[PDB]
Structures are given as C-alpha cells and as structure tokens.
Amino acid sequence: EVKLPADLIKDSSGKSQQEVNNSLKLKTFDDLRNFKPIVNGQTVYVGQRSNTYLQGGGLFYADTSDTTSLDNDGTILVGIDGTRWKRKWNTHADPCWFGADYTGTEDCSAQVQKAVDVSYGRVWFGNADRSFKMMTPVGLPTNSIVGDMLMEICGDGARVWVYSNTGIFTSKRSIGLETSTDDLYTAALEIGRGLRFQGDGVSQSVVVNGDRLYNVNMKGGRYLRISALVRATQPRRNETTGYVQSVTIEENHLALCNRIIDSKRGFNVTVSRNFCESCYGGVYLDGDGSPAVNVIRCDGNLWESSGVFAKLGAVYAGTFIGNYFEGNNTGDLPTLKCLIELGKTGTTGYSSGVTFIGNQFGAAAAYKADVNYADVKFTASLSGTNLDVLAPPTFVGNWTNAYRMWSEGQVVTQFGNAFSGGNARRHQAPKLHTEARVTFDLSRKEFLSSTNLVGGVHTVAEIDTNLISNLASQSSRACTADMNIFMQMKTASNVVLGAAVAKVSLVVQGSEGIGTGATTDVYVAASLTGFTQLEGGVIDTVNNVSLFKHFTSPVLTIERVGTKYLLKLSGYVAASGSLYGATAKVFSSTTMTIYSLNSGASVAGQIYPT
Amino acid sequence: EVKLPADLIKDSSGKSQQEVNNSLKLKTFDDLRNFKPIVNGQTVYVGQRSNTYLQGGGLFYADTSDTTSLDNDGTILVGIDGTRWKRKWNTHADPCWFGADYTGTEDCSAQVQKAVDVSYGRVWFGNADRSFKMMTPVGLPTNSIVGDMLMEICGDGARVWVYSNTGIFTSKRSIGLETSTDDLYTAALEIGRGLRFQGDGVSQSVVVNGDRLYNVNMKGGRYLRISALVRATQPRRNETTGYVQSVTIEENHLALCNRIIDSKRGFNVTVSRNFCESCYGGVYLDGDGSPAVNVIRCDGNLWESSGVFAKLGAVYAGTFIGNYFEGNNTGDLPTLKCLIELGKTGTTGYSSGVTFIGNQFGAAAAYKADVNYADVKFTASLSGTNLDVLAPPTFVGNWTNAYRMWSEGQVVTQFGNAFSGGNARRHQAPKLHTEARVTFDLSRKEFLSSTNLVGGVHTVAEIDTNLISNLASQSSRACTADMNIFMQMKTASNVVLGAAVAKVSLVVQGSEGIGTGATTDVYVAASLTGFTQLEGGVIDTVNNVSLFKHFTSPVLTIERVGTKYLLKLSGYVAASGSLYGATAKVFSSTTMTIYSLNSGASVAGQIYPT
Amino acid sequence: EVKLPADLIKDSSGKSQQEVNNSLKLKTFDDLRNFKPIVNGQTVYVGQRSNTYLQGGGLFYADTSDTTSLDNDGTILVGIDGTRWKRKWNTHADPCWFGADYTGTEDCSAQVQKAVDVSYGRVWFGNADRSFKMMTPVGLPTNSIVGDMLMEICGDGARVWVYSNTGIFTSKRSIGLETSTDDLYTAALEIGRGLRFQGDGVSQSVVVNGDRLYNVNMKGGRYLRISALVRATQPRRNETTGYVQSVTIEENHLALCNRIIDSKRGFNVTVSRNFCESCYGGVYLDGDGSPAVNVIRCDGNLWESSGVFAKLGAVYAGTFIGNYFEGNNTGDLPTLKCLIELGKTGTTGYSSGVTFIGNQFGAAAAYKADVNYADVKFTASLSGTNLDVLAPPTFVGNWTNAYRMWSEGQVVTQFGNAFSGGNARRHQAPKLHTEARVTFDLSRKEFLSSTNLVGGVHTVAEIDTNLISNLASQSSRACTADMNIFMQMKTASNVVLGAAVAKVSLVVQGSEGIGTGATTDVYVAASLTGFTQLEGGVIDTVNNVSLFKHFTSPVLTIERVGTKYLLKLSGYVAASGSLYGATAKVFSSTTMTIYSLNSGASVAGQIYPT
C-alpha cells in the first residue's frame, strides 16, 4: 500500500535506484548489452550466456577508455550504449564463454578457436559435466621451435568428442593451405591434462595433426575409441611421406584406439608409461625411408588384449625398456603375427641400433605354438661379416612364452632372456660365453732371469689355487682352463729382444665326495698344447739387431709351491752380444679361458694367474 | 532524522528495496535458505557455510525450473520458500562445500564422499592453509579398464591426515563388500598432485586401496609418515593373496613412510623418480607366486637413510635403472642385510629376466665389511646347464662399495660394474672376455687354386699387420692370437667337395723400447696347433659322390707380403673325376681369438684376417 | 524532477541506502579502505588495485573479530574505520594481489616474496597476458628433506623475465647469509608448470639457486635465453665447490639457454625428456672431485643445433639412454670437439660405471671426418689389468655417423652400436664374440663304464647333428668347433678317483650347392688336439688314496650313431683297490666353442653336446 518505486530514488552517481538495482539482475548476455553502467569501471556479474545456455557467466567491467573494440561474444561484449564490457579473467580461456555446446550436439570448433585466439593458445574445457564435439580443425598460433610461447590444451575432466580425419588440433597457419609442402608448423604444446578425448569408433577421430604440431607433450589424458592420437600424411621438406617430429606420449589412459601414431616417418618419438587397454594398434611408422624412425623409445607401457604395438620401418637408435604385454590377439596381430615389426620387413629398410630390455611378452594361447609368430619381427643385414653400419637389435633380460621372441637368425647378441615353454636354441642366436659358465682371467708378471732360470729351465707363469681351496663345497672347486702365455723377453731397461706364446691346458681337481680324510688342497696337471716364437725380424735398423730365438724345443714342467703352480719351459738361452745387452727377464702377459662346468653349481672357476 | 525505511521502496520485480538489499547480506548457508529470490535465475553470493565455518562460500543461482531436487548441503541448497539454489561451478569439487573440517579435528570422509559423487570422481582439497582428516574409506565411482571416465584426487597444497588400515580411497562398489573375492575395482585415477598425505606414525595410514584401484598414476604428492601408499590384502580372481595391478608411483616426495607398496603380488608396477628420505621400506611384493611380480620397474629413485628398497618375490621382466642409494641402515635392512630381495629367497619362487643398470649402491659403513650383506639378495636356479626358463639377473654399469653387490655365484652375466673397496672375484661370477682384453675377428676370403696353389702348397688365409704398424705407441702393437680357419673346397660353381679346419697360434712383435733405429714393421710367427679334415661322407646319393680328403699330412708355412702374411698348407691334391668337376678354390671362413694383453694399454689387438 | 536522494533511505542494518549502493562501486583498493561495512562479515568485490593497476581484484570479507592484523597490501587490507578486510582465496597466491608489475618494467620480486609468505610457498603467476620481471632472489620457506611442506612455483602461461647471477628462487633462510658454508637449504619444490622463464641473452639469468634448493622437480616449463636453469657456486659441508643435490629437469622446452645446470658437483641428478633447441650448453658438472657426479641420468632428450650436452667430471653410476642428437655445432663443442665429456679429462678424476644405450649421435658435417672428434670424450684408467674400482663406460645399441663415438682405446665392452660412415675398428675396442658368429654350448653326461667301455676304449662325449640337418638352407649347416671335455672318473657313489680334460677340434659339412642327390646328413671329423690328466694328489689323508691315472696315451676315435657322434678315448684302465671301490663311470662336463662362420648367413652353429 505504501509503495515508492525505486525509480524515484537517485543514487549519488546520478542514476536511479532502479538502475542500481538492475546491476544484480543481469542473467544473460543480452541483459548486459542492454545495461548501462552506473559508474566508470563498474564490475557486474552476468549469470550465463542466454536463458537456454547456462554456462559462460562471469565478471565484466566497463572499460570507459575503450570506445572502439568489437564485440567478440565471449570476452568483449559491447552494449547498446557503446560500453565495452570486458571479462575479468587471468587464467585459461573457457570455450563456453563464446558459446561452445557443452552437450556435444553441435560442432563447437569455432568457439574453441575463439578461446585459442584470446588466450595465446591456452584453452581449458572444464569439468566432467561437459561434453564437447569438435568436427573442424582448430589452429594454434605460430610459435617456432625457438619461439617464446608455451601452449596448453587441458581441462578438469571434460569430454571432447572428436570428428576429424586429419586432427582437430593443428597449426593455424596451415589452415587454408593444408596440403602445403612447406613446414607450416607450430611448436611447444601440452595437451591432454584433465581431458577425455573420445570417438564413436564408426568414424574418423584424430586429436593431434602431427604434420603441423611439433614438440608435443601428450600426458594425463583419456582416449577412448580414437582412430589416432597423432596422424601425419602430408609430404614436406625432405620427406616423400608425412612424418611426426618430437612427440612424447606419456602417462595416458588409452582404450579401444585404432592407432597411437599413424604415419610413415618419425623423429624423436616417445611413447612410454601409458595404460593401453584393448587398443587395435600402437605406433605405426612403417615407411620405406633410410631410416623411417630417427630414435624411438617405448618404455613401461601396458599393452593388454590389444593388437600390434609397433609396426615400424627402419629404426635407428630404438629402445624398448620394460613394456608389459599380455594376451594380445586383435588388430593386425593375427595377420602380421608379431607384437613389434621392425625394418627390414618387406619393402622397409634395415634397422640399426635397437635394444630390448626387460619386456614381458605374455602371449595369448594362440601364439605359444605358432611357428610363424615372433614377438619382434625383422630381417637383419647379415650377408657381410661386418655389422658396423646396420647393427642388428639386441635383447637383454626379456621374458616371453611365445614360440619366438624374434625372427630366427636375425639377432647376434642376447643374454638374460627367458623363453618359457620354448627354448633359446630355436632362435638360431649365439649364446654368450658367460651362460656357458666360461670365465676369462688375465695377469702380467715379471720373471727376472736371475730368479727363475735354472739349467735352461725358465719359469714363465704362476697360477694360484688358494681361492679354489677356500670354497666351501667340494663340488664347486674343480675346473679346467686354457692358458695363453704371451712372453716378452726384455733387457734390464725393458728392451724387447724376443717374443713367444705358449698354449697350455689345465685340469684342477681335489677331494670330491669324500668325508673322512678329505683335504682342501686341489691339484693341477698342465700340458703344453702349442708353442711358437719369433726367430727373426729387424728391430733396430741402425745397429742391425733382430728378435732372438730364446727357446730351443721347449718342454713344459710345473711345480707346486704352497698353493701356487709355477709353469716353466726348457731350452732357454738368453739373447746377448748387442747394443742393448742381455735378456734380463721374461715378461709374461697371461690370459686364461676357464671352463667352470663341473659336478657342482660353479659358474666361474677360481683358478687365476698371479 | 529524515529516515525512510528501505522496506517502503518497491523494486520493479515487485519485491521491496529491503529485500533487494538483503541479497548482499547472505553470509551463511542459513541466510540463503531463508532468502527469497527477487527475480528468476538470480545469482547471489553466499559468504561461507556458517558463522563458525569460514569455507564453502560461492555463487548460487535460483533454478526456477527445479522444484524437486533435494538439499545436499553443498551444491543444491533448498530454501524455506522451496527455491532450489544451485552452486555455480565448472571445475573440481571442493569437500569444503559440504562441510569438510579444514582443521583436521573430525573425520571429513563423508564430506569428501559427497564431493566425489557430484564431480564424477574429481576432488580438489585446496591450499596449504587447510588440513583434513580422513578415517573412513571413500569410494570412487565404477569405471572399467575400458571405461569413459578420468578421475583425479588433487589439491593446491592442502594436507590430508590419513587414518586407515586398508586405504582411504577405494572403489565405491566394494563398500559393504570389502572382503569380496570378486573384482570390484575401478580404474583410471590420477592422485596426489598438490596434496600432502600425512600420518602420525603411531597408527595405520594407507592412501590407496590397491585391491580395488587399478590403473593409478600417483604423481606430484608429498607423503609423510604414511604406513603404505598402496596396500592390497584381499584374495580375488586367480590369486590366493591380495595384489596390485597397473600402479605407477612417480615424481613424489616420500619421507618416513613404512612402505611404498604393501602386498604379496603385482602386475605392471612402476616406482620411479621419487625423492624418498628416511623411509623404512619400499616395494614389498614377496608372495610365493610363480611369479609374484609380472613386470616391475624402479628407475631413478632417491633412497637415502632408508630401509629395504624392495623385498620382492619371483620377478619376471624386472628392471632397476639408475637408482641412487646412500647410507641405508634402518627398517628391515639390518635383518635382511640387503637393499633389494628377489626370488628365490626362502619360500619364494625363482625370478626370470631382471636387469640392473647404472645404480649406485652407496652403503653405510656397517655393510662395507659385512660378509653376509649383498645389495641384491636372491637364489638362482643353476642346477641345470640350461637357463632358458629361469634367466638369472644381470648387472651392467652399477657402482657399489658394499661387501657384495649380489649373492655370490647367483649371477652369470655382468660387466661394467664397480666394486669400490671390494673386488669382482668375491661374487663368484664369470668375467666377460672383453674385460680380459680379448677381442674376436673374422673374415671370408676365396683362394682360387690357379693363384694360390704351387707344388702342393695351398694358401689358406691372409692376415694383415698394417693397422698394428699404424698405432702411435710401440707398447700398443704386440699381441697374440688364435686362428680357426674353416676351409671349404669348392668347384667353380661353388659345389663343396671337401672341408677342413686348421688351428693356428700367432705372436706379433716389433720394435719396443727402442729409440734410434726403431721400425714400424711388426713380425708374425705362426704354428699349426691342430688340423682335421673330413675324408668321406655321401653328398650326392644319385651319382655317388663323397667329400674328398684334399690334404695329406699338411705342414703350415707363412710368407710376408708387404704388411700381410699368407698362411699356407702343404700336401694339397684337388678332388676331381666326378660330375661336378675339380676343386677350383679354397673358401676360408677365418675366425680369430686375439689376446691383446701386452706391455701397453692395448685392449684390442689390431691383427685381423683379410 | 521527482528525485529523492538515496542517502535519505535507511537500510535495516542502520546504514543509508547510499552506503548500501556504495558496496557495488568499489573499483580500487583505496575505495575499500575508505568503505565501511554495512553488516558484520560482509563480502564485497574490489575491482582492481588502482585506476592504473587493473589486476589484484577479488572478494574481501570484513573480519569483525580481527582488530589487530596489519595491512599487507594484498590479502589483509585495513580500512580507515579499522575494519580488517581479508581476501577470500583457497588456491594459490597471485603476486598481482600485492602489485607485481604484469608489464615487466619494474622488479616485482618483493611482491612475489609477499605471495610466497602467505601461501607457504605456493605461487601462481597467471595467464600469458602477463609478463613479470624478477631481479632480486625470492626465498622459499624452510622445509627439510623430511619436512611437512610441498611448495610450487607455477602459472597459467605467464612470462617471467629473469635477472639474477645466482638464482631468482632460493631458500629464504640463506637471504642475508648467501655465502654461508652452512647447509641453509630448503626442499620439496615443483617449479615451471605453465610458466615461461625468459632472459634477454645479454645479461645473467638463473632460475633456481641449486646451492639452496634441493629435491626440485622442474617440469612443464619454457626456458628461453636463460643463462642457467640451475646454478650452484657456494662451497659448503664436505665440498670445496658448489653442488646440486636431487634436481630433476624433465619435460621442459629449452631454447637458446647457455647452460641447463652450471656447477662443479652433483648428487642424484636427472635431465630427461626435454626439447632443447639451439642451447649453447647442457649439464656442466666438471669439478675435480672423486667423484664429481654421484648418479646422473640423461634420457630421451632432444639436443639439436646445440653445444656440448654434458661436460662432466668423474661420474659414478651414470646412464644416458635414448637421447636424440642432431647437427650440434656451437657453444663449446667446436673447442672440446665432443657432445659429452666425462672423467677423466684434464684435471678431472676417473669415472666408474657409465652406460650409453640407444642414443643417436647425428653429427653436423664438420665432425664426420674430424679425427679429433668423439661423441663421448674421456680417459679410462687402464694401466692395471684389474678394472674393479674404475669401471670404464660401455656402449650398447647406439648410432653415430661421426668420426668416433668415444675416445679410442678407452672402452672395453660395447656391442650393437652403429658407425655409419666410419668403422668400429677405429675405436680400438674389443669386439664381442657374438658379433664374430661365435657361440658357446655345454652339457653334462654320465658314461657308465658298463655301457661305454670296450677293450680299453671309453666313450667320453656325445654330440648331435640332428638340428643341423633340420635347417632349411644348405649354406647354414656347416660349422667348426672346439671341445673342452672335462672328465671326472667316479665310483658308483660319485667319489672322484681321477680327472682329465681333452681338447678336440671338429669340422661339420654336408651337401652344399647340390640339387639332385643331396642329403640332409652332415658329417663330423674330430681330432684330439690336447690332453692332460692328473696322475697323483692325495684326496683321502686317512686311508692314503690319491687321484689315479686312468688313461695311458689315449687315442681319439669317433663313431656315428643315427645323427649323433660318440667321441671315445683309448688306453683306459679303471682305478680300483681302495676303500671307495672301482671307477664306475666317466662324468664329462663338455663345453664347446662353435665357430659358425660359413658360406651362409649362419650366426650360431647348431652342433651341440648331449
């Protein structure tokens, strides 16, 4: 009854109380454009974009100094009075500010593009209540490999439906020139943190256009039914196919994706520590280049119920450390019959420098007995004895239960691998001598003639058995061994006047299987199997001095001293009658080849040269 | 004196000016529930939850279309007039919205659970001024390994006091059925970014229930006096104990934690690049399974003043690359006397495929001379000569100063390791031939009879010394070597009519210790140590052709040509009188074993076959 | 015309309507300090700091309980009426709250310091529209290695211009005592996420003071023309130079930086997976310590058009896995002529335990033919035959096209490496026997005398050719081999009464080059090259039993049985007439050295002992 309208009250600014009250009633963008500020620099809150679009709200301040900026329908809203309202924001741009459909019904790429332009490429898609749909490539601003920008595409749980045969994210400067042979790239991008990229699986969905996006860190994202995380099919620069360059795919959750990388060539590629579940294909870089892949690392990934993890071309400097493979039987795996393909395979070039360490190749039952299956398939270049240029791959400490871990005969060095249900011999690969319980030893010892020369018999070597006797078990002590005793006959000043080499064979055996009366002493029998010496050769062309034949039909004798054995040769006559004087010593470089296999578990025979 | 009450002024909405003014006085949640909106879709700001609870404030809009939603005391607040007020938020849920005690006095798990339910598992705990206490497991929504969700538990520095024997975070669908043998799991979780999990050290605190949380990335968090980051004790599926599956613990700050992982079985486990200070235990997965651990990687960790870093059972495909151990002497280390335990140890099964690369085992003074200490303790399965199934672990490029790096006699392949203050021999392990300065060479050369056959003497091999002479130092030149000359006698069309092998021993020596008159030429003396040839064997059952004895008591002669040496055998008579014709050449596959040890620093003798 | 001033309307709080209206007109900090709250606990919005400073706005509530807190010009603003206004914030502190110049014109370090103090070291710099300049070190609060804090320096794209010779970020407790020899450190820091650190390149810019900041994760940042990411030059504790401790530099974008790390000593250093473009220097830790670096890992980095990647001192437990080097020719590289320098070089100590796996050393054209260039330069300690203490570095699976991959003669173990355009021999390094197509085999077989003794001829070994015949290609079958047959003569209860060893040489050859009439059978010829046996040695000192000479001038014969070959020795007489009885069997531990080189691509000869 007692009612005074607020329009009859005047605020000190000159505007009515009704106009002051109206600044708390700004629900939509249209309400702001129809609102006139009461003071200069006023900040008001707009609730949402429209009555149907519940996102896009925020604070807007009337920039009284700006009378020319255009309305962009997101961060600069121009009122009917001409007031330039500008959104207050110091973080990442939200495509919802510009009207991106958070229900996933319509293509929001144009609105995502608007958020890219005002944020210098730093876009954030919000929480899990939002689901966006992008069907048009969005271009990131141009930033060279040495540029001053850092771009990010991230979120707080939102979902992005992807519809693109080439990549919903690319370089802005390639838009309109998508098929250009020029390097229209942009670099330095973090993408995926807090984002769920998803495809429907019945159409093409590519997230990153690898033709145009270099130096990319893809981490922390979920990818579901995505045809390819990265794709590149555009020839440019020195390449006749598309290629990817400096892409790191790490710590993601991949599921039901057709490919991780889809291209023909790669530079500095990393795909490590990703949880991949039921993916139909991994890293495909199977072009015919020399090489196709310049460095790839695939470490600590999970690859379960999946297809071919990597179908690669020629690979230089490849590493695959600690991957987890379990029950993979889909995608191209039933046809290629391998988890990894390297060069050369078919038209592909030869690989060079690839190392597999600590992988588990847990096979589905179908490939345990498939004679045409190998975990890693390739052809090495072995027609020449020299392997300098095209180094075949090596395998260290891996575990498989498949028919084969690699193509038979294509690997030269491998140790520590496990072939559960199969055998190493089937791979036609060399076995390291260590796994045959063969160990090598060596020593250098000087035998002065004044001490080790009696009646033409010269001591040439000394071995010890004291550590053999120290072993606890009788069955560990015995061993056999070869000896290469390189003898250099020298004067007092170490001038070499002669040279020879002896080949000796040994057997070491003590008490074995004996309780009462057993001893720790172990005995050696030696036999001179070979001998050769130089009988000539000018070593001093000024004074006419030649290497001297010091031994005349030598015979080997050994003598036990304590626990040691002195090996000696007969028929010794020292050189003399020259500028350098007489031979004062025999300097012996002894190298032993010990065969440790005995009745016990000894892997290294403890005989050694002193 | 001149006072008109605001209740006598009417706003265009129909409500009084006093009611318009009241929308700026909403301090607590009770003020909002007692407030009636002036327009439809009005957004007002609530300052805090109550007069005592200073958090939980935010913007709320009157959803005029909603007349049925229930009050949840956090994001949907229903007023006395029936207005459904809904919080404006597009980011992560804050448990403080629902009343989580930010002082750490009362259990806030129920409020954390409320934030989980409305955020699809994306909870954020705020800044370092907050300290929460959780004593009841909070369950994350169900998401399979191929599910469409990505969940996160993160913060901006807040602290969470943990009180749980099983894990404050688990799967929601396991709540009420915690002891179920079914796989009531949920997957895809990022946890720890910007969060400080802390226990009091006098009670049980577990962060992640590994029985129910799979595909977990634990990164960026601080953990202080936490009994276990991950624990799993519930048997399920094919396992008779609890197990962890696809857990990655990376880039965290661990201090005074009792265990990193506490279970008996593991699948696809990663614990890398964590700063661990004074932790009493690391990765414990020491069940009796075959195996206990299916792939584990522990790389680049810091482990100082700590206990046993890893007490594991049987491990398949294990890798430990580049860890940093320094002065560890607490926890179970004084009893187990090792930094890492592998299978087999006690009841545990045998390991297969484990590689240690580039670790530093910096011991406390107590374990440098402890004969019962080894950095890595295990028992290998060496009763058979074949090591295909149970591949013993290998060690490459590690550094220790402890008594032992591994259990004596249990390692077959190891190179590049450093045993400061100790010795390699004490490990009873084979020494690679490369470390004994032994190098291998090989060549294939054809010696046509028309060129290399004079009076029954046939040239069979050719070695060169030109690169020996090229060496700068005299002491590097000399060497000795063995020769395996596999000779295949072939016709013009490369039909093999005979086969033999010669064993040759060589010594190479030139000027050494000589100034005036020295020459670069080095001389070779050879000796035929062994010879054998095939004298029969049907190779053509249709025409009745057998392998022919080409040599009759051969004698070895050598001839110096330039810098090369031609090795020749006598008593040669070519095969003839058959369908294939006469022997036209000797095709020699020469393999050399070079013993490089001399008076200099030569590690590879530069004699080689041509 | 009909105008009632708002000052004549009274709100229920007792304040006039004009004062109520004024709470929506608070543009600057001065407007808030001049504003009096209408109710207790009122929250008002301040638009910005001043009319010229457009940042720093936010919500402030009148804390009626606080009458003593001082104004800090950022989060606590005290009004003229004495009202303590406190900013509502539960996230990271913004230096703009305190007036940090977002245009980069003036030093904002004092304002950054204010944000550190109120956030417990959790500072956030905002979006790419901001560019700050810091010229004074900002100190982080004290937190020990076992402390309860987690600190972060991050942003949302902002740029920070860096001007500091020591580090714009350091420990607070070192300020004023910067040259102290005490360990005035603080630990647990995440720095760089969403931040662009930039220098002008004509002055000193260091981001992290490594003398005072330990346990640092530097990830996700862009660094442009920064003199050093980490620098440490202050001697302290047991060190005579500065050092870095537990610094991880991972997943960054480095460009045109002078150094990554600039110091003389390091502990637990990680520099992995960084995109480095045109950087003039990497990890410099080249002090004379023993060692200089306690564990360093540099994995998966990009290093293009850059300088020396790592000039290190003595390194213990170093790893370099999978780096990508391409066309580096600037910085110190033209003078040092290497990509990596290790100890010893010059005054630097010797390294021990360093492994290079899977790197690509892609050289600029200038270093392909430079005889003074090597990818990794160092001097190994090879004056002694024993390499236990100072283990030389090893190289596995790397790829280079430079003149050398390492300093000649300084590497002992290396395999799988590629030397495009060069050769392995030039490195003066041993070649693993596997690359020479040499493979080892072994077996243990018991030959009971009742079965394998006829007329003094005793079967001592059995080899099989069945798998040789199984090979598809004729050229793959043939091979030669050595045999070490360790024979232990035992009684029925396995008491060793004798021991001997035979050296045998073999040649295996079948049909080769033959179509019609060819057979799969392959034939063996054996020759006894060496033999030795023990003829004495007390094994039972109680009963006076010695090892017995079982063989009297033995002659080797072989017999083909199916596909097997039985090797036999003559002159056998069993021991007898003692407490243990007679010799009942010959237990043979056979170890074979197979030389697989033939006319085909065989790398492992398929002869084996049974």
Ligand SMILES: [Zn+2]
């Ligand atoms: Zn409206």
Ligand SMILES: [Zn+2]
């Ligand atoms: Zn962002």
Ligand SMILES: [Zn+2]
């Ligand atoms: Zn109240």
Ligand SMILES: [Zn+2]
């Ligand atoms: Zn979040």
Ligand SMILES: [Zn+2]
């Ligand atoms: Zn003003």
Ligand SMILES: [Zn+2]
């Ligand atoms: Zn933060």
